[PDB]
């Protein structure tokens, strides 16, 4: 039976720490420098406590429902508190305990994306209720559908590190929320930590320290750089000069955009995706006419990256190639469907979360 | 003869960097945001210079006296400046040079815990003298007794990553010291860096990227989260609302509490230890009626974690199981003895350090 | 044919992230706390955008020209956008894609060293032109000459991690530039991030998680500590007391000094190099009578470290030993020649870069 490779174990445990670093303190500092000074402490507390919450719900039943075998939409409850998972159990080429952790850290950053932006306007108890409802009914099923052998994966959707599961999912939850900068060095510091942590996020998604991890690593460097330049150029063009926030936004734009594509594309596709994503991101926030503008970058770039993954995975364009019997035509259709499903699923669940919270403790911070 | 495993080498070198990160700048920023603004620069200088000092004393004779073979209390001086340690020498499944580094980084964070808190009130030269005396007569012997085949290990004490060697040892040295917040975003940033670095501290204590490292990794995530929630709950209960400092303290509480237990317990035990530690930590600082309050968390949670390791390592409770012929009765007795010995040994040595310093250069900062 | 070792792949990918961390946000925060408050945002933007630029030029033709086979001074253009590099291509004991990334990250920090210091006084477009010219005509050829089988390597120059390619190269470019602290906690934070990232920089230069990486790791810890103490001592001696900036400068001094020597020397040589470098660094900045003073540390310590590598690599002094038939006499001569060549090559190219920029868009910020 399958034996764990210590090199992959090492890599994946370090990658998980890097993803945890994206939340604690990555996203917290990113939002901290953007929101009003008088709201920072509170937001920092909300991100820390909800992070703890997600970690616990993950171990208690999150992992089992997301990654256990079940149906197209959710797993099972046979892994409650990781029961039935032998310590030496192997998943892929690493111990399953590591997969649990790595996957849990993706749940954390996703929630951090939402809470950091909404902390200012939402009541503490309301956010806890929302987190519980949305992690359970949206994050878990979508993670199951994309990486848990569910509906989307079973139809061949390409999403290496979560353009759907993380970015689009959270962008929509945050935008439903919105519908209902004092420290730029701080924003930069959080952007930097997100960037560095993102190497575990993207490369670690290979599940092994192989050539695919190497590819995702290089593409991340390339798409992020291309997006910083694309954004900055659009900014110099529209506003006459680049800005620090523009540069950070650009980096996030490329990072988000390359997320679903990193392990399937060539460096050439990474450069193109990065440029398009930096520009689309700028167009995005511009059109979005607020820290919630952030969901404009995550949502627009997540959609763009997911669609472009269906183009650039082509052998012809330097990608690793589409699956057997799959054309670019067919693949693009599947990407569009995965995006639509994600937008609607997250939107509805988010609307139910906020509404439930509003009905139980009241949303609007007292 | 024993051959080094490159995966373990990679893992352990990365884990050492993560532990170094806990001090530089982890603990420095944690204390930096807590102490008075006018004292920050000085404290930062004291932590940096004493960190350099510990690194040098470690290589010169620290490692040899802690990890060389000798007696129940200390090693030998056959590894002065690492002489007699062939470059290719293997310790466990990694090169010995890596073990030297990894172990040295534990000495560093321990000292950083003490210096960051006392920098404000202690004279520079006095702290250097104290560091020399206490690292040499307390840290080294206790490290030798617990992880160097000394008295405590030879009696079967369980302490995976240093609830005694690091936490209790330093909590007591700091409290003897005490007997003789302006920037909360900064406190949060240091807490976050401590958390992330703590993965190398805890997981790296397996000495290999195996299932025990995976277990320690997951338990760290779980106990920290459980402690953040336990603390926050106690805070909402006693003070009417959670606070940022409460959330950070909770995280430190769970981290400290799970330190001796991480590699021996189940995730269920990790959750219970985390909750108890977050609450005990809150009770601790509360009773301690000052940045020195920090020693209340490290000391109380270190004791709690060490005792609970003697309960939760039981197979019955999801642990890896006690050693052959050892009962929970017998094990708890050994944990209590290791704690008592650590409290007294560190207390006496710390008292001698401060007193010597006071007699030579005067303690009270001029 | 050569097969990739996943442990080395893991290690090298994590080491690359650590080197990227040195720039984003390491050096940016180091300079951020040193320069005038009103110039921080701009400098941060310049470092971010030029970082993106270097990443792109690297992939487009940088890597190919630096590491492809060509002549003594530069490589070739057969690896444009990494064409002809099969995804599974192995370089040493890791996938070539990882070598590309790791090497690109060295290009980044080198440029960050220069831009962070000069951002204040240089026009944005002027710095972009300068970066393009200097990366292309100085960084690339020197990287090729030292690590790309060029002139210096082919004559046996010892420079494990870049005392010439990075430190001296950038110190000179910055000093030619100069010829034409408001937040010390911030300076400390950047110093700390540089330190931690430096473990990937130095250890990762072994290209594998072996005993040489272990040696470089330990030596880095030792030389940095020795330099912090040497600097601080010189400061207490000359100025009556240590300072936070002194402590950070000392750390950078030891880090720089041990860079070319880390993989060839014994810990004893690391301690001596560290002390000499901390003192030489202090003497340096002192003599330099400004954030550009930083080039005094990088340049003086880079020269010192490079020369001392020719002494301490000797078996007699605990080093790994000089190559067959090479004496310390002969080796020191080669070190001096590599330093001279680097100083002049970088100086001339830098002078041409600034001048071209000045002639095209004007240097002096409007």
From Swiss-Prot, chains A, B, C:
Offer a single GO CC term for the protein: plasma membrane
Q: Where is this site: Important for optimum substrate conductance?
A: 201
Q: A single Gene Ontology molecular function, please? A: ammonium channel activity
InterPro entries for this protein: Ammonium/urea_transptr (IPR029020), Ammonium_transpt (IPR001905), Ammonium_transpt_CS (IPR018047), NH4_transpt_AmtB-like_dom (IPR024041)
What changing residue 201 to A/H/L/Q/S/W does, per the record, is: Loss of transport activity with methylammonium as substrate
- UniProt-listed Pfam families: Ammonium_transp
Role, per record: Involved in the uptake of ammonium/ammonia (NH(4)(+)/NH(3)). Transport is electrogenic. Following sequestration of NH(4)(+) at the periplasmic face, NH(4)(+) is deprotonated and neutral NH(3) is transported into the cytoplasm. Neutral NH(3) and charged H(+) are carried separately across the membrane on a unique two-lane pathway, before recombining to NH(4)(+) inside the cell. In vitro can also transport the larger analogs methylamine and methylammonium. Also acts as a sensor of the extracellular ammonium concentration.
Protein's name in the database? Ammonium transporter AmtB
Q: Give the lineage.
A: Bacteria, Pseudomonadati, Pseudomonadota, Gammaproteobacteria, Enterobacterales
